[PDB]
């Protein structure tokens, strides 16, 4: 019972400094993300119908991104001052994981088609899309089911939960949202690129560059967040020490890098759909017919 070091570590200034940055990026992601993902769905549905299995996954990817960014104006209203905590958190993670699920499904569908010559009809792709959405919900369960509304604030009662829960929650998020998806799309697109590069395709050059971009963009937008989660998990795991100042730097880093990763769903329209000439020409026709 020495003159106790039980002094609270305050984060009041960090939150006040991070709020304007977070609010800004939220508005940016919602603006371009809703427009870009609408144009995706609009291009593959309006004039021409769904042709291949890729079109099915593109729409589902754009739909997942739409559901994600549409929660941001709700969170912005939350930061500024019915706002359902559990439900809004649910749509936040379900749309996030589904976005990562279909992205993974893009590579797989194009993997089995190129090297193993296994093609999927539209009818089957719709069935798999259902499975992924279901899988995205059951994997989001431990992220929103603990979230409730107390004193008009969305909170997670860590006292009524085990100490291992925030650790498991981080580990699942790290391997589930980064490691596994990045590992799959890298292996798939490496195999694909290595076949096309030696083929006699007259577009073999651009195909590889497109697939490389998918991997590069994913890393430069998600890696800073998960690498910050790793050192945060290390703190919880008591593997490293943590002073008051360290927890403040880690707090700010988690907030900033998280908002950075939200920009990736705005780039998805540029990574898959509007990178193809057919969708480029189609949009050019649509924008001309509506003007």
């Amino acid at each position, epitope marked *: 019972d020495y003159d106790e070091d039980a002094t609270p570590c305050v984060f009041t200034d960090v939150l006040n400094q991070s709020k304007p940055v977070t609010l800004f990026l939220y508005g940016v992601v919602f603006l371009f993300g809703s427009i870009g993902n609408f144009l995706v769905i609009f291009t593959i549905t309006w004039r021409r119908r769904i042709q*291949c299995s890729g079109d099915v996954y593109f729409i589902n990817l754009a739909a997942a991104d739409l559901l994600f960014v549409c929660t941001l104006p709700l969170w912005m209203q939350y930061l500024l001052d019915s706002v359902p905590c559990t439900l809004l958190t649910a749509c936040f993670y379900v749309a996030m994981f589904a976005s990562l699920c279909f992205i993974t499904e893009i590579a797989l569908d194009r993997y089995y088609a190129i090297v193993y010559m296994r093609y999927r009809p539209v009818k089957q792709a719709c069935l798999f899309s259902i499975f992924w959405w279901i899988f995205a919900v059951i994997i989001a369960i431990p992220h929103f089911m603990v979230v409730t509304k107390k004193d008009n604030q969305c909170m997670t009662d860590y006292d009524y939960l085990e100490v291992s829960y925030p650790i498991i929650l981080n580990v699942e998020l790290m391997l589930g949202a980064f490691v596994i998806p990045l590992s799959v799309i890298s292996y798939c697109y490496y195999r694909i690129s290595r076949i096309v590069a030696v083929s*006699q*395709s007259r*577009h073999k050059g651009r195909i590889v560059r497109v697939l490389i971009a998918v991997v590069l963009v994913f890393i430069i937008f998600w890696l800073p967040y998960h690498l910050t989660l790793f050192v945060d998990t290390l703190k919880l795991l008591k593997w490293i020490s943590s002073s008051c100042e360290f927890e403040r730097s880690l707090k700010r880093a988690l907030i900033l890098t998280e908002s950075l990763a939200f920009c990736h769903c705005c780039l998805n329209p540029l990574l898959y759909v509007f990178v193809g000439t057919k969708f480029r020409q189609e949009l050019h026709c649509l924008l001309a017919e509506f003007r």
Partner: nanobody
Amino acid sequence: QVQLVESGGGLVRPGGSLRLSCAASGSIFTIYAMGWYRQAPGKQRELVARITFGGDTNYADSVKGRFTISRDNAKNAVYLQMNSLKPEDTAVYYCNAEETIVEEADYWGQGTQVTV
């Protein structure tokens, strides 16, 4: 370079049948769909039959019920059985192939003549 070789055209009496054949000469693994196009004198180029390697088929309004399109994966070949031919079907039939990821369809055949 990959070229689409066409064969199976010719002349036939009204009500007869023909079988168009198209395949890729080179080695390409990124083709996911192929189809047939035609162009009558004084008219524009129109789609008549398209099939993907997944199985989903697409026919034109005027043609549906008479022509049957089929394909062969690994060989990148597409065949078109044209039963119950009409004099209005007289045009130059072109073969087309579509490519994944890059989403390009600049793969065309020389064009075969079909006169009924």
